[PDB]
């Protein structure tokens, strides 16, 4: 069960959410991940890529 | 489970970069701006055709 | 039969421990360990600052709590009076905006 | 007799796993990794900061 939890922590990487009020370039890490997620989904739509 | 998750990371380079975004946020703000901005510029160039 | 079952138990456990350690090396690269250190130091500085604001706020509170229940009734009466004066001053400010 | 042959193969694999375990521990130590820097430790440190801000307010 401990090994399965270590595999979960490697797969989720929860530390990235520990500082929500830090801003770099006038945006929070969450807003940067949202910009990334929107840009990745726009690029997957444009590439006609049947995922 | 471990063999499945490793094959996902080897096949999807965009997911591998997503997992590094927080490293760039704390170490190199210009590189964060450049990586996200290159992905956004590759999506926006479609109005001069 | 006893020796064979012992050897199979040990081999299964060592395989499990090996895969765990390989996931931990894949997790904690030198660049990420540096970022985790910056995050730790920012969090520890936050925890230390808040423990100090909490302690100072509790000491000033205990100095007023020593003045007894009759003082706490007088504080409630003054707070209720100061709120009414603030409401009446706000009403006067809105009328004078309406002349050209 | 089949179990005895399989026992030899299991002992040989057990020594192979001990070697990989040592190499992985040496790599983790070389990365400057400490127990307070783990994902679990830092999340627990974030949760304790949020609990303290609620008490301070």
Residue numbers in the entry:
A (entry chain D): 616 to 666
B (entry chain B): 549 to 597
C (entry chain C): 254 to 353
D (entry chain A): 173 to 229
Which statements did the authors publish about this structure?
Branching MT nucleation depends on recruitment of the MT template and nucleator, the γ-tubulin ring complex (γ-TuRC), to the side of a pre-existing mother MT to give rise to a branched MT with matching polarity to the mother. Both recruitment of γ-TuRC, as well as maintenance of polarity, are carried out by a conserved protein complex, augmin. Augmin is an eight-subunit protein complex first discovered for its role in localizing γ-TuRC to cellular spindles.
However, we were able to establish unambiguously that augmin has a relatively uniform radius across its entire length, comprising a cylindrical density of ~40 Å in diameter. T-IIIcore is composed of paralogous subunits Haus1 and Haus4, which form a coiled-coil structure and intertwine with the coiled-coil C-termini of a second set of paralogs, Haus3 and Haus5. The remaining three quarters of Haus3 and Haus5 form a continuous coiled-coil that folds back on itself into an extended antiparallel four-helix bundle, forming T-IIIext, a bundle of equivalent length to T-IIIcore. However, in contrast with T-IIIcore, in T-II paralogs do not form coiled coils with one another, but rather Haus6 and Haus8—structurally unrelated to one another—form a tight dimer that then associates with the Haus2/Haus7 dimer.
